[PDB]
Nucleic acid binder design. Structure first.
Lengths: 185, 262, 56, 124, 141
RNA sequence: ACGGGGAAUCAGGGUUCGAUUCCGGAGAGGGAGCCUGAGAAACGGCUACCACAUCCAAGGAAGGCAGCAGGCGCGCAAAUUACCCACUCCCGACCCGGGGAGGUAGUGACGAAAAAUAACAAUACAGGACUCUUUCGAGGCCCUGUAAUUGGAAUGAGUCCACUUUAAAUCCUUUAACGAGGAUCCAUUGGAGGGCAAGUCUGGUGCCAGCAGCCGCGGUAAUUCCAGCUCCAAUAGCGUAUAUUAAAGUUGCUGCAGUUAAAAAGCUCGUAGUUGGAUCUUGGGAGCGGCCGU
């Protein structure tokens, strides 16, 4: 006996066919479009949807005005509407099924850095997060898979311990100050 | 085991203590006493998990050993004393008194009471015994043995004991229309009038209890604790008044306490 | 059996020294260039699509 | 440029303390030491630094904020009577024994061999 | 099924149970005659002592000598032909060596050319036969 | 074959696993018998016999790791003779003592989550929108791609003052000062005939050596070997062996077959088993939202 959890799950499912020419086609485009690193980065969003989507499939088959279906209905909508995917006026648990993987990758903070103009490319936007240059409500986010919320969308700006914001210069420019006056006298 | 159990595992510990998962292997096993292992709450949990006067296990020891804690009027220095239902915990130095009534969900409601209300409590009688010289006896839910009771007190009733003397003052006889705290099963912590006493020879009598909102349910006769005559209680109820709003209704009144609060 | 010429060809194949190779990009950078090679570079060419290792 | 904002305040009149969760704002510098903490609490809640036990900090990711627990006592006698002997020992006013449990365990079992007063005439 | 009646659970179950033995993959697994005959005794891998080096003739369509090793297991004392994989790997295997021996792939059926050679050599004296091939280790003598 | 809670796979059914931290049971080398006690047929209690083995001055004495460490053996197969009662709790005559229970480190690619290995410029230069020009070409408002061409921005891995952490530390976090151009601080592992994403490329071998799960390849132009280059796939992982699940509507309850592919007893009787015809309460009343629903 030990005071431990052991509770863990896989967040991705591997594709049944390892070399579908038409699957490699799409999944490699979704990497280049939203600046991902591997297929695992794609597959886990495919699985988070297929979870969300599977819950909605089950509620649609329940009786109309079931207390579970009504309560669990609004939560699954509010969960999607908060993260800014499904519309605030089209919050109906049928429209959850009519929903795709690009609707989530748009709410990935890597893309939301790039689509706010404080990066130049999506592959640069990942550098600006992984090298802790940004923050969400004065909280430095190091991780580009930070699925941004709707009210928490307009608080994404640079860090205050970074030169790209209102902060001190890094290492390369601070070795130029050693050589700038070092060679002069 | 080949003898009695002295350890309780944190996982096998009952849910309504709401002890977390990750702090330790063991839970505080209640010492034997007036209340059942599951249906009680140890002093240690009331003194650092519910009220947070202590932080660690030694801190709970270094509070109760000064005799500051006074469970129903008679001081216990036992950190694993089973402080169960209706028990009147009296912290005299901070000047706070607590009756242990159930919340409408599993847990015990941390309910503050007036020091006048901390003088008496309510006890459900469990059986009538006749003693060794025709002396009649009561036994209560909290093991209190009272003798020479009122002859109109039967063995599903409740009695109003006094902490100073340990003697009955008034009682609520089990009739229809009288209030009822449900002290067990899925309906743990409901309040409402008794509308049908349904008799089953051999098996257990089910009793239908109607809530203030007409939210009618049923419970076995074992899990009934009559707290008043008609729609008027003899005690101080916890906030919400044991009415049990549903998860659809609990969400609307949680969010309006964030919306209108900000 | 004739266990004499065991490991004949691997033994006698004329060894070519492995060429000096500029170190490859790894992670997203390998995967980024792989996106640019397939979906932005080439025009829709007349005939059937030539493979990644198309040599003739 | 350190600012201490205490939070989740509580009074144990049954342990003789004012216990709270200290939430420190120290933007653009290292985790502030316990010595700098207590001296700000000393001229915030109006107490001598003798009776303040600050401990168990957790620095937020980002690096301008720490939230730990602190407890401020009525007296130094009360500070020692109802306290873990490790949190006392940080200020040097509890000096624990120096020999390990492995030393004591063999010494317990070596004493257990001998019957009578002449237990102590065997080990050391 | 055939008998559909609402009170026909014991026949449908007992029929399915009786007729399951006529399956090959079942009766092989659920009578222990396969496991008693399996030289590994249900183990994935097994260690054994090399005692000679056999040059196995391949099947008629493919005429070539498959250089295998007769291995005797540490646990059973049962004798086994184990296919030494690769071009020249047999050269790294000498008589009286604790070689780790695995199956070939088809779960106890002879694979491709090699007749009745169900096993292959994986390691030689706690050193992988892949590492000896690549030249990332040498045979400790 | 300890049972169960559960676990894996999973359309709907299922199939398989569950020694394993929670619950219950059992046992302490094999049996057996007892003492004390509220509670034991107790084994960190005892007494016997058996197996095993210990010290012996040879008379005797002593033992029980399926506790935590560790060793040997067995093997395809599994960690330190570390620190500590501070936490969780338990026991005691007890606020004080004790706890290899437990906790904390070590070992750990069993596994699960996050997630580096660059980024953005400049120019060569190669495309595409586009005014133009038949084309060739230039403008370039939009940028689009990649070079041992150059450029200045970056932050991390690591060395590591000090705090924080904690029983004491470690690690994380925090922070100084350092710390990246072939940013040599260099990502593997399997493959490239088909199934199955990827070379009719060179050089060697000549049914040899080897490959190859399967089909096949190798007989001197080898898309299959052995290598070089290029390329593909997954990626801090990837291959292999074996058990198992889906695939398997190839166990068929859902849902398979039985003329000829495997398969209807030679035939009839017959008891369990399974399965069994139709038939017995409907017609109105009386209010309800706009002949109609309640």
């Amino acid at each position: 006996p030990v005071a431990r959890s052991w509770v863990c799950r896989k967040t991705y499912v591997t594709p049944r066919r390892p070399f579908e020419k038409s699957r490699l086609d799409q999944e490699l485009k979704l990497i280049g479009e939203y600046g991902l690193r591997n297929k695992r980065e794609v597959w886990r969003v495919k699985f988070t949807l297929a979870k969300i989507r599977k819950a909605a499939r089950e509620l649609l088959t329940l009786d109309e005005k079931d207390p579970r279906r009504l309560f669990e209905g609004n939560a699954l909508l509010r969960r999607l509407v908060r993260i800014g995917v499904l519309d605030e006026g089209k919050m109906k648990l049928d429209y959850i099924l009519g929903l795709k993987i690009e609707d989530f990758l748009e709410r990935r903070l890597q893309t939301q850095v790039f689509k706010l103009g404080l990066a130049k490319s999506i592959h640069h936007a990942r550098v600006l997060i992984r090298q802790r240059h940004i923050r969400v409500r004065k909280q430095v986010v190091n991780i580009p898979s930070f699925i941004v919320r709707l009210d928490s969308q307009k608080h994404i700006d640079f860090s205050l311990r970074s030169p790209y914001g209102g902060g001190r210069p890094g290492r390369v420019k601070r070795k130029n100050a050693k050589k700038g006056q070092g060679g002069a006298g | 085991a080949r003898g009695p159990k002295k350890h309780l595992k944190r996982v096998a510990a009952p849910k309504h203590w709401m002890l977390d998962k990750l702090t330790s292997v063991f839970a505080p096993r209640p010492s034997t006493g007036p209340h059942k292992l599951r249906e009680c709450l140890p002093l240690i949990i009331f003194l650092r998990n519910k009220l947070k006067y202590a932080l660690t296990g030694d801190e709970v020891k270094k509070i109760c050993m000064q005799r500051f804690i006074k469970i129903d009027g008679k001081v216990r220095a036992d950190i694993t004393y089973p402080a169960g239902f209706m028990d009147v915990i009296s912290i005299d130095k901070t000047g706070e008194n607590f009756r242990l009534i159930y919340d409408t969900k599993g847990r015990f409601a941390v309910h503050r009471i007036t020091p006048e209300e901390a003088k008496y409590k309510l006890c459900k009688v469990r059986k009538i015994f006749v003693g060794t010289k025709g002396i009649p006896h009561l036994v209560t839910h909290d093991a209190r043995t009272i003798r020479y009771p009122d002859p109109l007190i039967k063995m599903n009733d409740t009695i109003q004991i006094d902490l100073e003397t340990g003697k009955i003052t008034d009682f609520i006889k089990f009739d229809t229309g009288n209030l009822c705290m449900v002290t067990g099963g899925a309906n743990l912590g409901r309040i409402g009038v008794i509308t049908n006493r349904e008799r089953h020879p051999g098996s257990f009598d089910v009793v239908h209890v109607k809530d203030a909102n007409g939210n009618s349910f049923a419970t076995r006769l074992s899990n009934i604790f009559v707290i008043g005559k008609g729609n008027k209680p003899w005690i101080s109820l916890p906030r919400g008044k044991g009415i049990r709003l549903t998860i659809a209704e609990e969400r609307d009144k949680r969010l309006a306490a964030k919306q209108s609060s900000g | 059996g004739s266990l004499a010429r065991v490991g004949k060809v691997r033994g006698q194949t004329l060894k070519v020294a492995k060429q000096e190779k500029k170190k490859k990009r790894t992670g997203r950078a390998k995967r980024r260039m792989q996106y640019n090679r397939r979906f932005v570079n080439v025009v829709p060419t007349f005939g059937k699509k030539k493979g990644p290792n198309a040599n003739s | 440029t350190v600012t201490i904002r205490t939070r989740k305040f509580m009074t144990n009149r049954l342990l003789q303390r004012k216990q709270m969760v200290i939430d420190v704002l120290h933007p653009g510098k290292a985790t502030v030491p316990k010595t700098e903490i207590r001296e700000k609490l000393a001229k915030m809640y109006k107490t001598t630094p003798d009776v303040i036990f600050v401990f168990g900090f957790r620095t937020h990711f980002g690096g301008g904020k720490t939230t730990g627990f602190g407890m401020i006592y009525d007296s130094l006698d009360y500070a020692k009577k109802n306290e873990p002997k490790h949190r006392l020992a940080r200020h040097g006013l509890y000096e624990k024994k120096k020999t390990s449990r492995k030393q004591r365990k063999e010494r317990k079992n070596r004493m257990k061999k001998v019957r009578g007063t002449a237990k102590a005439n065997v080990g050391a | 099924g055939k008998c559909r009646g609402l009170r026909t659970a014991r026949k449908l179950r007992s029929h399915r149970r009786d007729q399951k033995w006529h399956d090959k993959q079942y009766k092989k697994a659920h009578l222990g005659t396969a496991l008693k005959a399996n030289p590994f005794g249900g183990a994935s891998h097994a260690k054994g002592i090399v005692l000679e080096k056999v040059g196995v003739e391949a099947k008629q369509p493919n005429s070539a000598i498959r250089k295998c090793v007769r291995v005797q297991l540490i646990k059973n004392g049962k004798k086994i032909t184990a296919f030494v994989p690769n071009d020249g790997c047999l050269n790294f295997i000498e008589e009286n060596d604790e070689v780790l021996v695995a199956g070939f792939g088809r779960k106890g059926h002879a694979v491709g050319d090699i007749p009745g050679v169900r096993f292959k050599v994986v390691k030689v004296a706690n050193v992988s036969l892949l590492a000896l091939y690549k030249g990332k280790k040498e045979r400790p003598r």
